[PDB]
Amino acid sequence: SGAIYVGNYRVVNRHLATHNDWANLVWEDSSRDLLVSSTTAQGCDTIARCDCQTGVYYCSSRRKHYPVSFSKPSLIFVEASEYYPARYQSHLMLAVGHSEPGDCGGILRCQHGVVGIVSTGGNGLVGFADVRDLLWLDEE
Ligand SMILES: CSCC1(CC(=O)N2CCC[C@H](C(N)=O)C2)CC1
Ligand SMILES: [Zn+2]
Structure with missing residues (x-):
């Protein structure tokens, strides 16, 4: 959560x-x-407005923040779950890290602010829903 x-x-x-x-x-x-x-x-929280590919995320199933290198936001296939049917999840970034069920919502952050939240993983993977393109979060 x-x-x-x-x-x-x-x-x-x-x-x-x-x-x-x-x-x-x-x-x-x-x-x-x-x-x-x-x-x-x-x-x-402040949102990052950048193209960083290194940052730190919170893993609730370890009570730890881990430094990670992550891919640029992309359209990446996500195996079926109880939540989603095979498909293609857009604006997703992947890193090597622990994730297991229970962990979504943890923040990924860089030197500029919040980059996104844990959304996928498994495998010694963790994928991050990016929020850096949502410029309207900074106003209204
Ligand atoms: C080994 S469990 C990895 C997870 C859970 C996980 O990947 N999904 C289950 C919930 C929906 C996710 C989605 N964004 O499509 C897929 C990341 C915590
Ligand atoms: Zn940044």
Whole structure:
């Protein structure tokens, strides 16, 4: 579990969104595994606006933050789950790291701020839904 809290927005994995998230919906995209809802309180996270490929992510199944090298956001095949049918998840970045079930929502960050949230993995893989192109998170 986990979310990004920027301005009056809460960014979560679409597959983990609550009824309150759906009832206060700003934007959602199933191909990216992302959903954004509105919040009453202002958040403290800042979004990175960059092309970094190195950063650090939080792994809840290890209680640890790990430094990683990650790929650029791409259209990458994600094996079926209980959440998604084989498909192609867009704006996804991959790294070598531990992930197991339980871990989505953990933040990936670089020197500029929040880059994205854990969305996929397995294998000694971990994939990150990017948020750096969502410029509207910084306003309104
Ligand atoms: C070994 S479990 C790896 C995970 C879970 C995992 O990959 N999926 C299950 C939930 C939906 C994910 C999606 N973004 O399509 C796929 C990352 C924590
Ligand atoms: Zn950066």
